[PDB]
């Protein structure tokens, strides 16, 4: 019962806003989402979390994650996307249940051109 990250690939042109959708089986209703960017060497970078944690070391208004009123899914948006931003992105859900697993979604690609 892991989350799913869509679309498999979206392209935007050196600016504007690019948004992905991550959907999850919100059973417990007491959990956290992380939004990661995986480097070409399979190294991961944590871009955001819902709910938000701290804006000190992790300061970047570029990546917003917002919850939609339906509850099942969430929007992962990069605002005004620089060409540095193009890369492979992934979703991750964690449930605070005593096992505290991290259910993990699939890759998704993002391009920026024009």
């Amino acid at each position, epitope marked *: 019962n892991p989350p799913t990250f869509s679309p498999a690939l979206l392209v935007v042109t050196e600016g504007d806003n690019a948004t992905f959708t991550c959907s999850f089986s919100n059973t417990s209703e007491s959990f956290v989402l992380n939004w990661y960017r995986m480097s070409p*060497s399979n190294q991961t970078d944590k871009l955001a979390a819902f709910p938000e*944690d701290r804006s000190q*070391p992790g300061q970047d208004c570029r990546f917003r994650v917002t919850q939609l009123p339906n509850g099942r899914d969430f929007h992962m948006s990069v605002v005004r996307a620089r060409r540095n931003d193009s890369g492979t992105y992934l979703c991750g859900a964690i449930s605070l249940a005593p096992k*505290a697993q991290i259910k993990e979604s699939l890759r998704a690609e993002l391009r920026v051109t024009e």
Partner: antibody
Amino acid sequence: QVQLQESGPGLVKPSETLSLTCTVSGFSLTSYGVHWIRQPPGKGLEWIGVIYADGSTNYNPSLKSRVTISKDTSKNQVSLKLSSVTAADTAVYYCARAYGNYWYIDVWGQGTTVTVSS
Amino acid sequence: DIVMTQSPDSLAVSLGERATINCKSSESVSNDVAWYQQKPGQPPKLLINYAFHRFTGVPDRFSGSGYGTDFTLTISSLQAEDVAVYYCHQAYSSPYTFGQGTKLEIKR
């Protein structure tokens, strides 16, 4: 090949100013923050400070104002200066890279050992 | 500040068995905890990042779990090349403190 190498005096006399340098290969200091971490003999790791990508610094309060971290990107070099040292400061000093937004320390230098002694 | 406390201080487990080291935070930290191993004379090397993620290139027997205040490093089938000291490290609020370290020695 993301690399950090430290260099500095192996012996400093007490109350001197101790200066170490960390030369970087495989990334630019404009995009990555660099931390200085310290390890006394047989003791644990102590976080000294960090210079972020932009250039804002942040130190450990136990080093109230004796510590200063700077960088020169042209030389790919990060420098640590600690004033008014005592024998409580002899330790191995590592420089290390912080990776990603919401960061973690991934690559460590080999560490250079500094002894404070008259 | 924030103090990370590891348990136990030292730990001796036979080969092929499972080894767990625990790390607890005074102030709640939301998964910004990394596990590093360090053997004598070499620098610390990163094992786990983001409390759960196995870093790139580190063997499959290393795993991390936990969130908020309780975290566990777990080596599944411990083998000889894992004798070291293990440190948790929080990147949540400055000063970004470390754990005291747990020496993992193996029984033979």
